[PDB]
């Protein structure tokens, strides 16, 4: 809850700005997040989690049709209830 300043680098997470746009790097944990001025979340994620992750950005597999596997794990046709 304590508002901190920026940049900020605690716990292996470097919270920096790049090209006038804000970045959060987690290279130790294998990800890079950022935001632009307009507000557009982006997540670059390492192939280590190939076939492993599952969330709102779908699984990091090759296929692009099966990546609605719910928190239980259910291929749901709907992009909404998912």
């Amino acid at each position: 809850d304590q508002r901190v300043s920026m940049p900020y680098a605690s716990k292996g997470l470097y919270l920096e700005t790049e090209a006038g746009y804000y970045k959060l790097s987690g290279e130790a944990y294998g990800f890079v997040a950022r935001i632009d001025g307009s507000g557009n979340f982006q997540v670059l994620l390492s192939d280590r989690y190939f076939n492993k992750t599952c969330g709102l950005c779908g699984n990091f597999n090759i296929f692009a049709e099966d990546d609605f596997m719910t928190q239980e794990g259910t291929l749901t046709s709907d992009p909404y209830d998912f």
């Binding site: 700005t17 790049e18 090209a19 006038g20 746009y21 632009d36 001025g37 307009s38 557009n40």
Partner: protein
Amino acid sequence: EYARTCAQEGMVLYGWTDHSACSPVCPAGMEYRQCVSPCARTCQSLHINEMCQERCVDGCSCPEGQLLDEGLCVESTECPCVH
């Protein structure tokens, strides 16, 4: 989005925003470049090189001179000192 999504694949595009009549928003002094290096040579920087072999990232950045100094683009002549 379509610009970046192609760029991530290994094939980048260029100057498409020139005629699109839409540039992404950025603060004063900068506007949207495409494929600027992340290691923006700023004002209060050490002049070292060939460590920043990172991939190239899109975003807005200063003009050719006009080094960065605290979130704005300021001319290289007026680089301050710090103590």
